Design a protein around this ligand. Structure first.
Ligand SMILES: *[C@@H]1O[C@H](CO)[C@@H](O[C@@H]2O[C@H](CO)[C@@H](O[C@@H]3O[C@H](CO[C@H]4O[C@H](CO)[C@@H](O)[C@H](O[C@H]5O[C@H](CO)[C@@H](O)[C@H](O)[C@@H]5O[C@H]5O[C@H](CO)[C@@H](O)[C@H](O)[C@@H]5O)[C@@H]4O)[C@@H](O)[C@H](O[C@H]4O[C@H](CO)[C@@H](O)[C@H](O)[C@@H]4O[C@H]4O[C@H](CO)[C@@H](O)[C@H](O)[C@@H]4O)[C@@H]3O)[C@H](O)[C@H]2NC(C)=O)[C@H](O)[C@H]1NC(C)=O
Ligand SMILES: CN(Cc1ccc(C#N)c(Cl)c1)C(=O)Cn1cnc2ccc(C3CCN(C(=O)[C@@H]4CCO4)CC3)cc2c1=O
Ligand SMILES: [Ca+2]
Ligand SMILES: [Ca+2]
Ligand SMILES: [Cl-]
Ligand SMILES: [K+]
Ligand code: NA
Ligand SMILES: [Zn+2]
Length: 805
């Protein structure tokens, strides 16, 4: 109930929403059907449109008009945005040259430069180039300010998850807006773009920018907008709020546009009908900038022009149907479209089998345009699992395609030519970022980055302390002239032991054997030097990784590699080695095929054992430093140390052996040497964070050897590849992966073929940021380089995507 018979007189677009059953006059009242009876009349004036004309100049004020051209309009803050242009001989902002804003140039009483966020729905990254001739205001923002070639959205590349990520710095799994629709099994409720359910705060986790601001005494404008408020009225409203008295005026403002997404769905991303919505958004930017310039705020405000996602060509005839795969299609519920999420139709049905649903969807047709996953098996880079609203079964849909349950779902609602939602690596889903203002740099291009990073920057722009989030604060300092943020390296929590030779061979009863007894003081002092760290500056190029949690571990030096060996998990946490461009690949000699050697630096009680592997019929083992890349037949024995061994399913060993035998050397040839850090990851509760020992769900049978859920590698080289990895004077170049440690290769449909046809494709799919590995391991990398820490933070957030140009 609303008693809608109150009034908006003097309250139009008020900033504090009032409580029921009193009626509302704020920019959301339309969405709630709760506006006062006279909201349209008072607050949504339209008379005479949105522009001053020569004959309105100096007119007598008429309060019915949408905006004003009377002499008093500037002091009242309600001129049409082109008033000064028409009536005072001023130039449009877009026609002025650009001039560096070295300091904020703000009116008296401004405590800080306001931040205006201009969000554009469906604004694909390549519109910046392709629509450039029709977007002069946007092009000026872009060339004069700071811009990236593109900005990476979060998965799914849908509207609500991305806008709320922009606002919180959090992955959708953490903020809870995990799709444009979602069902919460605990609420027994569905959230949709349509309806009132989305109004309940219980869906919305984290701490969005407006709350962060309010909590810290910085006033915020409303970020949501009712769809029926036209764009021109949104701009005028922001400009009027900017003319409020100092004590009442917000410091942060948000404009949102439904375009070009709305037309993109109907016409496809580059339909000839798309030129107009781009012109219209540009005109709106032009209104805002002219309005700012009128208010002498155009060299005071920081403006962020940002999109939520791109748009891909998608049509009804490219729909895969689940009824084509399953027999039991009526026992499931599917969230359809550019992703699939599958759950049972009924909790009461105990004969619903996720396992058999997956198997019936796996590699079933040779052209198949989607791939089923248990959510914990999805690439870790998507961070799309740790929420009860994300269904156990997920379908990753090929770009340009849809999935639907049954044909009747498509024809009983061709409508659309565009859609989005696909994997956030997909070129068509990339979106835009421009920052313009005194705090941003002048005429600067920055590399692409992820939208999860922006919250920290917007907090910096506003002098706020960010709430805990998924950005890496400092990784975007290079966007800013001032207000940076001074990041510092986390303190190491556990210092390593450096064990010497402490155990005799016969103390070990590991059930291991090696053919290693073949009998010199030239090469005996030499071997000793290597065990004490003589070659360590060759194989550990960026310092040892810091351990950021409490644990017991040892540093182990070898001729060819260094490792940090965990006495708790009985295997290395990291193993580091450098492979020059000139290095040779050799085989594992026949006599050494099953060789595992006790490590006389590490106690029997802190070692793995061969017997456990013998008895575990599912589980085999591999090595972290690859024997194939030994520097000499003699150094090769070090690779068979029990301290270099890790548990591996035979199916996974096919992947790992190809990476180690073929791909490392390829990368070293292509990149002029690489440094490799490899290790296990344990994430049994799929939260993206390192497991404690008591979270491990699987061990090598009858042992305390825990089984990794994943294996990582971080592969670093010189960005200037004319310099070798091991003697690089400048910036670095990195690629990394987090491969799932699976007992089958069901994920790869061509796995029956030679490794050269599928392994590298798998690794590419599981590309990762260094930062993702850091969360999953509690390690901190690149502790000792000659680069600035801000630069290292940018390097740790880099993702190598393997998309074409
Ligand atoms: C990305 O960034 C984010 C933000 O930094 C990282 O997320 C944080 O991770 C922390 C560790 O997992 C986590 O801290 C825990 O919080 C518990 C308190 O939780 C509430 O309070 C906060 C603060 O205001 C709030 O933000 C939380 O919000 C969640 O829940 C509501 C729903 O109720 C949602 O609206 C919201 O979207 C959010 O959901 C997400 O998080 C939860 C987990 O909290 C997931 O389950 C969801 O799926 C979703 O992702 C909460 O409202 C606190 O209780 C925890 O403490 C336990 O653990 C410690 C170990 O140190 C121990 O000392 C304690 O004893 C305690 O154990 C007891 O509870 C156990 C669990 O019930 C029980 O089994 C035991 O036996 C004990 O009794 C813990 O400190 C933090 O909440 C989230 N924050 C957010 C916003 O998600 C995220 O990790 C980053 N991602 C990556 C990849 O880096
Ligand atoms: C497309 N769109 C642009 C946009 C702009 C910014 C973001 C973002 N972020 C999003 Cl997702 C979207 C819209 O505004 C559409 N739209 C229209 N009317 C609404 C009315 C009420 C609400 C509620 C949601 C919960 N509320 C919070 O305070 C959460 C509880 C904590 O915050 C109160 C307001 C939401 C909407 C809404 O989403
Ligand atoms: Ca959108
Ligand atoms: Ca975990
Ligand atoms: Cl969705
Ligand atoms: K075995
Ligand atoms: Na397969
Ligand atoms: Zn859309």
């Amino acid at each position: 109930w609303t008693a809608t018979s109150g009034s908006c007189k003097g309250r139009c677009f008020e900033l504090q929403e009032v409580g029921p059953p009193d009626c509302r006059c704020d920019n959301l009242c339309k969405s709630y059907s709760s506006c006062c009876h006279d909201f349209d009349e008072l607050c949504l004036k339209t008379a005479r449109g949105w522009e001053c004309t020569k004959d309105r100049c100096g007119e007598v004020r008429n309060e019915e008009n949408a905006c004003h051209c009377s002499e008093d309009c500037l002091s009242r803050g309600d001129c049409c945005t082109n008033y000064q242009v028409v009536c005072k001989g001023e130039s449009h902002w877009v026609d002025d040259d650009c001039e560096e804003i070295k300091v904020p140039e703000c009116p008296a009483g401004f405590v800080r430069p306001p931040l205006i966020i201009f969000s554009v729905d469906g604004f694909r990254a390549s519109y910046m180039k392709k629509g450039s001739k029709v977007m002069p205001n946007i092009e000026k923002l872009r060339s004069c300010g700071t811009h990236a070639p593109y900005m990476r959205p979060v998965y799914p590349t849908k509207t609500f998850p991305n806008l709320y990520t922009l606002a919180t710095g959090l992955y959708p799994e953490s903020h809870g807006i995990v799709g444009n629709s979602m069902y919460d099994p605990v609420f027994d409720a569905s959230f949709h773009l349509r309806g009132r359910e989305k109004f309940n705060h219980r869906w919305w986790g984290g701490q969005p920018l407006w709350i962060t601001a309010t909590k810290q005494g910085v006033r915020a404008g409303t970020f949501f907008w009712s769809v029926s408020i036209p764009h021109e009225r949104r701009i005028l409203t922001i400009l009027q709020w900017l003319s409020l008295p100092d004590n009442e005026r917000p410091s942060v403002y948000a404009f949102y546009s439904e375009q070009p997404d709305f037309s993109g769905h109907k016409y496809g991303p580059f339909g000839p009908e798309m030129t107009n919505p781009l012109r219209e958004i540009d005109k709106t930017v032009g209104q805002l900038m002219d309005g700012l310039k009128q208010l002498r705020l155009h060299r005071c405000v920081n403006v962020i022009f940002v999109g939520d996602h791109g748009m891909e060509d998608v049509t009804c005839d490219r729909t895969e149907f689940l009824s084509n795969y399953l027999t039991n299609v009526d026992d499931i519920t599917l969230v359809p479209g550019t992703l699939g999420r599958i759950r049972a139709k009924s909790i009461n049905n105990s004969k619903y089998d996720p396992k058999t649903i997956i198997a019936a969807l796996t590699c079933k047709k040779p052209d198949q345009h989607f791939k089923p996953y248990m959510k914990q098996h999805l690439p870790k880079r998507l961070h799309y699992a740790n929420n009860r609203r994300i269904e156990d079964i997920h379908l990753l849909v090929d770009r340009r395609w849809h999935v639907a349950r049954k044909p009747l779902d498509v024809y009983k609602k061709c409508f659309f030519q565009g859609d989005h939602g696909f994997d956030n690596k997909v070129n068509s889903m990339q979106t835009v970022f421009v920052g313009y203002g005194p705090t941003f740099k002048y005429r600067t291009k920055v590399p692409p980055f992820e939208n999860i990073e922006l919250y920290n920057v917007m907090c910096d722009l506003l002098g706020l302390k960010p709430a805990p989030n998924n950005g890496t604060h400092g990784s975007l300092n290079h966007l800013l002239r001032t207000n940076t943020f001074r990041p510092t390296m986390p303190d190491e929590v556990s210092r390593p032991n450096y064990p010497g030779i402490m155990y005799l061979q016969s103390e070990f009863d590991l059930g291991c054997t090696c053919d290693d007894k073949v009998e010199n003081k030239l090469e005996e002092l030499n071997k000793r030097l290597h065990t004490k760290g003589s070659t360590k500056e060759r194989h550990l190029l960026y310092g040892r990784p810091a351990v950021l949690y409490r644990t017991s571990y040892d540093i182990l030096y070898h001729t060819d590699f260094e490792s940090g060996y965990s006495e708790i998990f009985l295997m290395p946490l990291w193993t580091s080695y450098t492979i020059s461009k000139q290095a040779e690949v050799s085989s594992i000699p026949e006599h050494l095929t099953n060789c595992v050697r006790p490590d006389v630096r590490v106690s029997p009680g802190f070692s793995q054992n061969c017997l456990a592997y013998k008895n575990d019929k599912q589980m085999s083992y591999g090595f972290l430093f690859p024997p194939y890349l030994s520097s000499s037949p003699e150094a090769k024995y070090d690779a068979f140390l029990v301290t270099n061994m890790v548990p591996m399913y035979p199916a996974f060993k096919r992947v790992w052996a190809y990476f180690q035998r073929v791909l490392v050397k390829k990368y070293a040839s292509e990149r002029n040497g690489v440094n490799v850090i490899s290790g296990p990851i344990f994430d049994y509760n799929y939260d993206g964070l390192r497991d404690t020992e008591d979270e491990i769900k699987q061990y090598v049978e009858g042992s305390s050897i825990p089984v990794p859920t994943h294996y990582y590698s971080i592969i670093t080289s010189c960005l200037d590849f004319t310099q070798p990895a091991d003697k690089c004077d400048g910036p670095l170049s990195v690629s990394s992966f987090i491969l799932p440690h699976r007992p089958d290769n069901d994920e790869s449909c061509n796995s029956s073929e030679d490794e050269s046809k599928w392994v590298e494709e798998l690794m590419k799919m599981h590309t990762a940021r260094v930062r993702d590995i850091e969360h999953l391991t509690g390690l901190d990398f690149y502790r000792k380089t000659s680069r600035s820490y801000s630069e290292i933070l940018t390097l740790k957030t880099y993702l190598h995507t393997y998309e074409s140009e």
